Each structure stands twice: as structure tokens, then as C-alpha cells.
Amino acid sequence: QYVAGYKVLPPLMDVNMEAAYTSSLLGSIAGVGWTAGLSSFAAIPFAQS
Amino acid sequence: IFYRLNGVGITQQVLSENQKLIANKFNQALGAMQTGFTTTNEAFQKVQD
């Protein structure tokens, strides 16, 4: 990093943050995908989805 | 506007009973950006950019 001189910036999202966001997507794919209209949440058991 | 709101999963009954409140909310929303033009608008910043 310094034998030439440059710094690698870490990303804005931390590892726990992608973990939480992907967890939210994995929990919400069953919910949103039942009928159009994103206002409600419809977290059906998955096999029914 | 009534038909478009009907299409997104809102029943006719609340539309037929609450015309004035949704009209006032629409007026407030379409007046919000009139006083909104400052640095906080991302689109305004991109136009300036």
C-alpha cells in the first residue's frame, strides 16, 4: 500500500449491514410476492408462496 | 385520480367519503416542492452539476 503510496477505502456498508439487508430480503420475498401493491405485508408460510 | 387510486388497491368507498382530505393532502404535496428548492434536493444538485 505504501511502497507506491495509495489507500484502499473500505465500503460504506459493513458486513453486518449486508447480512441484515439480505436477511430482510430473504424474509420479505415470501411476503411481497403475493399480490401487487407494496403497502401491505403478506408474510405467508413459504411453501404456500 | 380517483380511477388511478382505485387501480392500486384502494376501495371506492373511502374515495367516495374522503374527497376533501385527499384533495388537501394532494394540494399540500404539490405545494411542498414549491418551497423545497434548495441544496437538499438531489435532483437540483444534479442539474447544477
CA distance B7 to chain A (A): 10
Cβ burial A6-45 (10 Å sphere, 16+ → b, else e): eeeeeeeeeeeeeeeeeeeeeeeebebeeeeeeeeeeeee
Q: Please tell me what resolution, in angstroms, this structure has.
A: 4.4
Phi-psi region of A5 (alpha: psi -120 to 50; beta: other; left: phi over 0): left
CA distance A42 to chain B (A): 14
**Which residues on A lie below 8 Å from B5 (Cβ)?**
none
Please indicate if any CB of chain B lies within 8 Å of the CB of A38.
no
